[PDB]
């Protein structure tokens, strides 16, 4: 049983993963993934920071999916305060929530192929990604790591003109997904390296807490967005892409299908986004508008206290989970009455998925392990936190 460290710096291994492996022949006898090569303290650091200054940590937890993560903390802090965002902000979060799902899937499908050896899909879709980033930048200011979705709504209304461009792009992106397809969905070779690799049973997927496409790929029907609606994902209409004969190829097809379904959700959001405000009107939770803080005393006091001290969330604890592109992203945020949190365990769709690597890659070749790490969309930020 030859032992070998897949290696932190592996061109294939996403980020840095030391996958100590015992390989009988080329077959992988045992898979003991090592983690923490990217532990950084995100959970302890948050205890020493106020709610609004811990929002930027969430973007960094799994930064492929920059915003969708922010929505989970937002929702969580809103629940604890029993405040809910204004109607326009909700649609925004679903608009950028979905755009972000595409961004993650373009990452997951194209990076999967680069490790497999197909390199042209990545360049094709990274150009589309690029175009999306620009939406982020023109809405938040940052290409990624925006900090746009804050605990009481979004930070600033969309620029005057973004919606139109999030249309032109959406109107075309489909063809770009279609192309990748003509390149990989039916390749006589993609199928082989992906089909019947890492099959996970339905009962086993629920047991190991997979909770993501990984469950959906095995045929279990669960989309937290339809089962437990958050924001206004209830008012839209989309089809969860369930899969059968769950294997690397089937789940892939599912991720390409949610890229397709997210364009259906984005279209609607553009078609039906309401006129209104983008942040709660409670100066108590949301910072006062700058014209107001510069002309009204109560607004300055509320601006000064909010930025310097904080929300002062009422004491309680909540586990709120959304459907981040990877899977169920949840924040268990225990909170004392103080302005700074007490605990914030981030449930990472990924801590559970990696664990499954062992029960998925059994009697498999070195190349199979590379394919399976891809079909779990492992971003070491969320796993290591």
């Amino acid at each position: 049983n030859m032992t070998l460290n897949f290696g932190p710096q592996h061109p294939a291994a996403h980020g840095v993963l030391r996958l100590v492996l015992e390989l009988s022949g080329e077959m992988v006898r045992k898979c003991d993934p090592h983690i923490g090569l990217l532990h950084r303290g995100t959970e302890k650091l948050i205890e020493y920071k106020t709610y609004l200054q811990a929002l930027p940590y969430f973007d960094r937890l799994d930064y492929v999916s920059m915003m969708c993560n922010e929505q989970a903390y937002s929702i969580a802090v809103e629940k604890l305060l029993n405040i809910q965002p204004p109607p326009r902000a909700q649609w925004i979060r679903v608009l950028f929530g979905e755009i972000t799902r595409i961004l993650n899937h373009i990452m997951a499908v194209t990076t999967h192929a680069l490790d497999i050896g197909a390199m042209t899909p990545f360049f094709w879709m990274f150009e589309e990604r690029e175009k999306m980033f620009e939406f982020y930048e023109r809405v938040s200011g940052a290409r990624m790591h925006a900090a746009y979705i804050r605990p009481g709504g979004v930070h600033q209304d969309l620029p005057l003109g973004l919606l139109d461009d999030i249309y032109e792009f959406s109107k075309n992106f489909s063809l770009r997904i279609d192309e990748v397809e003509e390149m990989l969905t039916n390749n006589r070779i993609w199928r082989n390296r992906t089909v019947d690799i890492g099959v996970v049973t339905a009962e086993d997927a629920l047991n190991y807490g997979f909770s993501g496409v990984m469950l959906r790929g095995s045929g279990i029907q669960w989309d937290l967005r339809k089962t437990q609606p958050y924001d206004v994902y209830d008012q839209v209409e989309f089809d969860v892409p369930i899969g059968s004969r769950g294997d690397c190829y089937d789940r892939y097809l599912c991720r390409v299908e949610e890229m397709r379904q997210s364009l259906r959700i984005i279209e609607q959001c553009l078609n039906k986004m309401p006129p209104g405000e983008i942040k709660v009107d409670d100066a108590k939770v949301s910072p006062p508008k700058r014209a107001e803080m510069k002309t009204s005393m109560e607004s300055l006091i509320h601006h000064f206290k909010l930025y310097t001290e904080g929300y002062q969330v009422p004491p309680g604890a909540t586990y709120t989970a959304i459907e981040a592109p990877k899977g169920e992203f949840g924040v268990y945020l225990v909170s004392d009455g103080s302005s700074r949190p007490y605990r914030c365990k981030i449930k990472a769709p990924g801590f559970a998925h990696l664990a499954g690597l062992d029960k998925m890659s059994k009697g498999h070749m070195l190349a199979d392990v590379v394919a399976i790490i891809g079909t779990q969309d492992i971003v070491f930020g969320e796993i290591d936190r």
Binding site: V16, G36, L38, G41, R60, R143
Partner: protein, 156 residues
């Protein structure tokens, strides 16, 4: 004919060859690779400028330390660094690797990679913009152009 002239010209050639092709290593750690991967991508093609990823450290030069150098990975970085060919340059990318970044005061994060590997160009920004990395890679190219190794040999 003055060898001094002969020397400078020769050095320049040497500098042009190195500066022109800077095969960067594929070192990606804390989600700045996403930006780097953007550089490699079509809007801002790294290749045009000579850059072409080559993971076998042995065959790679510039090491773009994109991301947070956690304590557990610290030794590894040093190793890979030590195993690259002789002329090796390091381009720290990201506030998380220039200094400590959002995670500077943490117990598991090295406050900077320049505490583990000598760093030549520091590219600033939490997700340092891909154009900014490209600016940083281009400044490494001006740093190499100025290097005058053979003239110091001659004058030594």
């Amino acid at each position: 004919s003055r060898a001094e002239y002969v020397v400078t010209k020769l050095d320049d050639l040497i500098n042009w060859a190195r500066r022109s092709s800077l095969w960067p290593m594929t070192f990606g750690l804390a989600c700045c690779a996403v930006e780097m991967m953007h550089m490699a991508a079509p809007r801002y093609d790294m290749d045009r400028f000579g850059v072409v990823f080559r993971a076998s450290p042995r065959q790679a030069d510039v090491m773009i330390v994109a991301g947070t150098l956690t304590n557990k990975m610290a030794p590894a970085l040093r190793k890979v660094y030590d195993q690259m060919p002789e002329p090796r340059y390091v381009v720290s990318m990201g506030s998380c690797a220039n200094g400590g970044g959002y995670y500077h005061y943490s117990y598991s994060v090295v406050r900077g990679c320049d505490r583990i590997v000598p760093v030549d160009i520091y590219v600033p920004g939490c997700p340092p913009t891909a154009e900014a990395l490209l600016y940083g890679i281009l400044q490494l190219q001006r740093k190499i152009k100025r290097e005058q190794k053979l003239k110091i040999w001659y004058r030594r």
